[PDB]
Design a protein around this ligand. Structure first.
Ligand code: HEM
Ligand SMILES: [Zn+2]
Ligand SMILES: [Zn+2]
Ligand SMILES: [Zn+2]
Ligand SMILES: [Zn+2]
Ligand SMILES: [Zn+2]
Length: 168
């Protein structure tokens, strides 16, 4: 059954159906996420360019173009202020409902399917060791390499763009 989503800092129920855009919910990826809390776009290369464009436009002014940190914290390291952000469910809740200070809610802004691609991008830009990563499966941990923006700009993004964004 359905996940119940709660505000990261308060525990108040997030009204996902009430607040999310009407469009972009009817995808296999969203249906699995709303049931499971696991984001099936994670480490699907095909979903990454779109996650990156969303990120750059709305998040990187504060969190940095590669998640390095600016006004707001780094998102590309092993350390989390709110440690349930090591799960896709927690990260979704932080993004959807917001946190303290200048971190406001973005639930109302992003179609659910796009939210999931954004989260895949955030996972992809990780550059610390992932052996303990709560958001990767056993096989994914075996294949995950620290993000290198140089490779991404040279070859990574081009190849991602030619691939399909679809779940397994
Ligand atoms: C855009 C949609 C965007 C994303 C994505 C995002 C993510 C994010 C996370 C996951 C956290 C929690 C980090 C952790 O647990 O360690 C977090 C926290 C803060 N952010 Fe953010 N953020 C997005 C957008 C923006 C915008 C545009 C701003 C600045 C105006 C901003 C800033 C902040 C701040 C400040 C925090 C710390 C909040 C806290 O409670 O500690 N983010 N963000
Ligand atoms: Zn259908
Ligand atoms: Zn940057
Ligand atoms: Zn961090
Ligand atoms: Zn937003
Ligand atoms: Zn770039």
């Amino acid at each position: 059954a359905q996940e119940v989503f709660r505000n990261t800092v308060t525990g108040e129920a997030l009204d996902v159906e009430g607040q999310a855009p009407k469009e972009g919910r009817d995808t296999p990826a969203v249906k699995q996420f709303m049931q499971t809390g696991v984001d099936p776009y994670v480490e699907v290369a095909g979903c990454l360019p779109k996650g990156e464009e969303i990120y750059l436009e709305s998040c990187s002014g504060c969190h940095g173009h590669i998640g390095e940190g600016k006004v707001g914290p780094g998102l590309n390291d092993s350390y989390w202020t709110y440690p349930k952000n090591t799960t896709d469910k927690g990260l979704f809740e932080t993004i959807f409902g917001g946190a303290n200070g200048m971190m406001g809610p973005h639930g109302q802004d992003l179609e659910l399917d796009n939210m999931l691609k954004l989260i895949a991008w955030i996972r992809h830009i990780q550059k610390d060791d992932v052996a303990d990563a709560d958001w990767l499966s056993d096989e994914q941990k075996k294949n995950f390499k620290p993000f290198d923006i140089k490779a991404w700009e040279a070859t990574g993004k081009a190849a991602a763009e030619k691939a399909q964004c679809k779940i397994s």
